[PDB]
Design goal:
Chain A: InterPro entries: Ribosomal_uL15, Ribosomal_uL15/eL18, Ribosomal_uL15/eL18_sf, Ribosomal_uL15_CS. The structure is cut from a larger assembly and holds chains A (about 140 residues), B (about 120 residues) and C (about 200 residues). Chain A has about 140 residues and is an alpha/beta fold. Chain A is about 25% helix and about 15% strand. A three-stranded parallel sheet of chain A has the order 1-3-5. In chain A, strands 2-4-6 form a three-stranded parallel sheet. Chain A is elongated, with a radius of gyration of 29 Å. Chain C has a two-stranded antiparallel sheet. Chain C is extended. The chains are: A alpha/beta (about 140), B alpha/beta (about 120), C mainly alpha (about 200). The complex binds ligand 3HE. The structure holds seven RNA strands.
Chain lengths: ~140, ~120, ~200
RNA sequence: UAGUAACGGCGAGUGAAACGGGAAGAGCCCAGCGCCGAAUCGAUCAGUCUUUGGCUGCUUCGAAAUGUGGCGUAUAGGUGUAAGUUUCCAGCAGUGUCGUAUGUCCGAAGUCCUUACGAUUGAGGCCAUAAACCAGAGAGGGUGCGAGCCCCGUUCUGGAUAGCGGCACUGUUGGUUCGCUUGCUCCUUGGAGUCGGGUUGCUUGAAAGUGCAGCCUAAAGUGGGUGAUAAACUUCAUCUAAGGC
RNA sequence: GUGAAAUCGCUGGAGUGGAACCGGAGACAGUUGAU
RNA sequence: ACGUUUCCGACCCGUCUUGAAACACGGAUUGCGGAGUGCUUGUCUACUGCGAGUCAAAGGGUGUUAAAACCUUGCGGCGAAAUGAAAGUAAAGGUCAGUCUCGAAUUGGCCGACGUGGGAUCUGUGUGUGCAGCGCACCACGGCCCUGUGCGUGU
RNA sequence: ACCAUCUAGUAGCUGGUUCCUUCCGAAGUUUCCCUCAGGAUAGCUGGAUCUCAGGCAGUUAUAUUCGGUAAAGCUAAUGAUU
RNA sequence: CAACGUGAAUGCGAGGUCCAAGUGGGCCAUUUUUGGUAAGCAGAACUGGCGCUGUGGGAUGAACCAAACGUGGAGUUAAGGU
RNA sequence: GCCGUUGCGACAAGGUCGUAACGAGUAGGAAGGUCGUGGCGGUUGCGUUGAAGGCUGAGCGU
RNA sequence: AAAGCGUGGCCUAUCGAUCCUUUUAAUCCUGAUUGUUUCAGGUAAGAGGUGUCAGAAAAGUUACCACAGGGAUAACUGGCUU
């Protein structure tokens, strides 16, 4: 939208909104993130603390698929149960949730669980998740 | 959930909840009471649950006729400061006692975590 | 000269990038060309399936994907033997053979054997000479319903089923899942140290 | 995947891959071992054909035992045996079936009345309720700026014709086929100044060396390589380098 | 084809003492409107 | 009104500069051309759609006013969980009552996203104003929960 | 040397940077920088607005405090000095 | 929890967040003040100005005295004058 | 007296009107522009009885 | 004896980032085909030093000289001072 840009309203004013003293001039401070330790030090330290230096172990060819471990909280478990399965879960029968098929590998215990006990099948459980599920009356089943 | 909490308070059972924010569905909410809500936009899930629980959804023009002066209303809105952008507002990240979120390309040990963030490298604010 | 709170720039444009530019204005043209190539191939090889050879079922390699199956390169020789199909015969009746893959598990072998069996059930074989049929060749009125198949041969279904609700058993509840997981981790982590201790104890 | 792992006066900057979803999909041949062992091949001569090249030989020469050909290559392979099962190439002529950025030929309807103009294609009218007429053609160009209807053209998932092709079937000609699969049986099975190592230089995201090369050193045979932090000693897993399409 | 500005020539009017131009306010000349 | 004549005012523009009419620089005249753009990546703001989701890629299917439009995703991007170098671990308490080996214990109900102060509005009730109640957003002061780490125990 | 290309080489430096009205309206100061013709940083400035409907003020009064300059002193310490 | 009820003058609505420009050569004056014999010299403090600003006056002038500006009119004046 | 800005207000209106105060400005920032230019998707019309372009009287708008 | 006092010097100066090296610390974490031991890499705290002290690795000459600028800056005139 060139019609709405500042250049449209700056026609006729000599400096184009860049001043008569300072002037718009190429690269007056350097190119890129240069000088982060000498003359841009205040900006770098104020807005990007921790920038310079190096910390931690270094992994040659990290394997991200090993550490891939999506998680789900116990408070979201019931929403994963489809309505038809909820209808079928009657007479003490608890719905069975296979988190691996839904894409979650670990179950974390944040929030509260519904009245209906649930059977939860996941590769990993947190201690609080296990305690809350069992206290609500369901069971935790470990799958490979 | 906020609508449900508002209506479940002593005296608010039969009041009309007025909000100009979008009403979204909460997966963590298990029981939905009877809610009478006047709103601009209500998502499909929230609308279905409210109507299933015996509630009613009206528009602002309909509220103008029901309560022209705003009688028996409960005015609500969403959390205005609960935005990702707001987390980046405040004192600069590199200032003492500042918990502002920096603008980092990525998250990891190699991304602004060494000098000025731990006493092992120069200092820590 | 960055000013104020900004994300530090990262644009990789310091090379003479103007000499290596690739646009995608020919995307619909490529789509049309590939459709026309498929049509020409279908005309050429009718009534054989346009897709071509039949591919095998395969589990995705890593544990991030091992709960999903997909089309493989071909059928292993063990699977062909289990289905009673010669490799030479498979090449003729249009079944892909993966000469590198071998089966180490009965379930994986059986899935592909069943796939081969259903493909053979669905196969229609024309007589080698139209005048004189032979044994194995499909029957006359079977050869009339023959139609070219489009898309993958025996496409895979990716629908997700939900286990039926059941009763929570008492033995299930009495298990200590977190303690079990931590015990397994500890046992794997300390396996070697305990072996060293056992060897030293034996030597003493 | 990902501006990620990693590299970098760890500064400025640089920077992949596997898994995953797709397009397309096609597999094979040697050396060596072993068997037949010259069963192989080039020129030339003479016949013969559909001759810008092919087929036949007591033609004559030559290549080839320092080994041409046949079987055979990691999925192995071979011997014998029992079951099953058993052709394939190339041209020629026809019969149809179908494409052609292939030539040539062919096409619906006003130059109607009035008016305007230097010149109309401009303006108005052309039975009829719905009406000048054609329209599967109202793309484009030309014609005295303006045109579906004046012309070339345009539409007919256009026709006719000749030529090129691709197919499918018939006949014919020449060559060729003791084979192929599965079980059992016994036998058998592989690339060296290369790999690897030291050092030097370049190169890479490749980090106690990713790739390449010089010089020195220089292998082995369940050996060799690889598993991304170097080394011994151990669990294994996975391929088979130094030949080719 | 059209045929701008700068620059230039003619005819008529008017000004013209070491710049010329310009803003404000009238006058003159002139232009224009008046059921 | 770009004619003449009078009265008053009246230094040449652009630019750098503390300061330009300057004995500072560019400018003889006229026409035409002539300078904050493209793209990648960020961030904020405004608007639109949907909303714990959203957008879907390459691709595929169909489309002959066919580079369009229309349909189409176990899978991918961002978001829904953080924290540590890493191994890894990973976010529910409030209140009332008990037992007690009176403790860095234990049990059970009820409630369930914490407490207090201020809070537009809303509700009740007096008389523009007051009092009382429920309190959005937000602010202030605290409390708990997850993770890393120092101290420090035991059951 | 010359010719073409890399090459529109880079320039903290010089020059230019094209319509009209309306409203608001500065700075030449602090800190760091091989920094001193330049930057980053705070300040000064504009815009978007949002939450509310009495606590503020380049001014006084009351109360209470801080100071060692003008004046004063050296017939009070220090230092001169008739 | 109970009660008490706004406790100097004058003026006046108050607070919050975000995004960003230009600037980072200054100069002058009353008063104070350092270097210098002095300087239209160099360096500081408070305030006001010029820069960015025209207007009446000082014959003329960035800063002096008066006074700050939409566009017109009547009246009255400031500094300055007759 | 008139123009505009700002604040407030009335009116069934992206508008009109009322009212009080106000109006300096470089660098710079915003707003409005039935100010101007060239395309595109649409819409409204004019044209050899004379378009674009060019020269220049009566007006309109700060 | 106690109340008490003591985290260096009665107070105001006496000093040092990133990267790398090195040391001390845990009966610590990692080397991703399974383990053991070396070796290497990490987490925490010090030291090795940048005196241009917010921290480049650095000798001259040009009268053979060049470019971008500067009246921010010297040499001649003019100005203030004497
Ligand atoms: C501690 C001190 C400094 C250190 C070293 O030289 C400093 C580094 C700093 C840097 O970031 N890059 C470098 O190339 C040098 C060193 O070995 C000695 C002189 C002593």
């Amino acid at each position: 939208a060139h019609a709405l840009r500042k250049t449209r309203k700056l026609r006729g004013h000599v400096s184009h909104g860049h001043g008569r003293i300072g002037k718009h001039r190429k690269h007056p401070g350097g190119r890129g993130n240069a000088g982060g330790q000498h003359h841009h030090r205040i900006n770098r330290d104020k807005y990007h603390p921790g920038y310079f230096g190096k910390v931690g172990m270094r992994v040659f060819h990290l394997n991200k698929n090993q550490h891939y471990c999506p998680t789900v909280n116990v408070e979201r478990l019931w929403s994963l149960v489809p309505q038809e399965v909820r209808d079928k879960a009657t007479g003490g029968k608890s719905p069975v949730i296979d988190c691996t098929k839904l894409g979650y590998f670990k179950v974390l215990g944040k929030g509260l669980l519904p009245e209906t006990p649930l059977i939860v099948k996941a590769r990993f459980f947190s201690h609080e998740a296990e305690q809350k599920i069992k206290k609500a009356g369901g069971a935790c089943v470990l799958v490979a | 959930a906020k609508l449900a909490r508002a209506v479940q308070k002593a005296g608010n059972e039969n009041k009309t909840v007025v909000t100009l924010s979008t009403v979204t569905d909460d997966a963590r909410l298990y029981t939905v009471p009877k809610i009478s809500v006047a709103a601009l936009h209500v998502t499909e899930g929230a609308r279905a649950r409210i109507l299933a629980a015996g509630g009613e959804i009206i528009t602002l023009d309909q509220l103008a006729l029901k309560s022209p002066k705003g009688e028996n209303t409960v005015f609500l809105q969403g959390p205005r400061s609960a935005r990702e952008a707001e987390k980046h507002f405040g004192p600069a990240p590199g200032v003492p006692h500042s918990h502002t979120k920096p603008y980092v390309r990525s998250k990891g040990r190699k991304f602004e975590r060494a000098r000025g963030r731990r006493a092992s490298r120069a200092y820590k604010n | 000269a960055p000013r104020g709170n900004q994300m530090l720039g990262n644009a990789h444009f310091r090379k003479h990038w103007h000499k290596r530019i690739k646009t995608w204005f020919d995307q619909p043209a490529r789509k049309l060309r590939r459709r026309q190539n498929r049509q020409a191939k279908a005309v050429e090889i009718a009534p054989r399936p346009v897709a071509g050879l039949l591919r095998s079922v395969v589990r995705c390699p890593q544990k991030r994907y091992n709960t999903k199956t997909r089309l493989g390169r071909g059928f292993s020789l063990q699977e062909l033997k289990a289905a009673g199909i010669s490799q030479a015969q498979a090449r003729t009746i249009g079944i892909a053979v993966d000469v590198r893959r071998t089966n180490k598990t009965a379930e994986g072998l059986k899935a592909n054997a069943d796939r081969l069996k259903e493909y053979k059930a669905k196969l229609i074989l024309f007589p080698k000479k139209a005048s004189a049929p032979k044994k194995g060749d499909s029957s006359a009125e079977e050869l009339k319903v023959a139609a070219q198949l489009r898309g993958d041969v025996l496409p895979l279904s990716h629908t997700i089923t939900f286990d039926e609700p059941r009763q929570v058993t008492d033995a299930e509840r009495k298990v200590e899942i977190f303690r079990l997981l931590r015990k397994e981790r500890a046992d794997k982590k300390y396996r070697g140290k305990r072996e060293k201790r056992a060897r030293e104890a034996a030597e003493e």
